[PDB]
Amino acid sequence: MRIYYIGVFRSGGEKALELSEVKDLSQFGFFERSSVGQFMTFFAETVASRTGAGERQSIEEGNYIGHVYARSEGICGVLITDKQYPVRPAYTLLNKILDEYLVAHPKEEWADVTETNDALKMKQLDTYISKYQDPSQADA
Template structure:
């Protein structure tokens, strides 16, 4: 289950203009990435041009599935994924914020946030532990110094008599 591309385009009178796009090309070799990205950009624009305003469509292109949604204001979005990626999730993604589109994605994002908070808490606990260790060492050192001072004072006072 892989999502390769998410593109936002504006459908003009004659052609579609790419506004913004995000690609995940990590599964392709370094030398293929630019060609695959160019293919995805071209396919996204072509699908938007051929889709009527206010409709959704899914198109199979080679081993990819392209899901397109052209809104009534001509703003369009295209998702390119593999065949295993659920169509429902793609269209929900085109309608909403990606974090809200898929329940699993939303849960994963919340888990990631919780993990970051947990790491920060652990770091602060470790810092407190180090500070406590420093305080214990300083108190032991002060205790030893006070014992030495007491012994020295006792020796000094033992030779003198109080009248």
């Protein structure tokens, strides 16, 4: 019942553009935080790569769920939390996020971007995944 990774990705064909990438490593101390992180992103990028826009994905792992929410314009977005993390709020998160990514800069201004700052892009998507840690949070 705790999210682990969140971010965005621009469907760049066979591979997903690392639009934005936010991590959540609570149990993954200074030993798994590194390994798991690559796990989260690598998967997050893959999902968006698997998600050819216009559809959503949920990657169920031994103890992880890599939700996926595709845009309606051109740049996709991915989410990853625990199985005990309802999709409904993940949906609203996909709402403010995709709207937040497209808002930060005109619709076409990004279109595909092909170059983003996952390390300092979409402060929202970041703060969201941090507080979203709860099963829902009720947009709190």
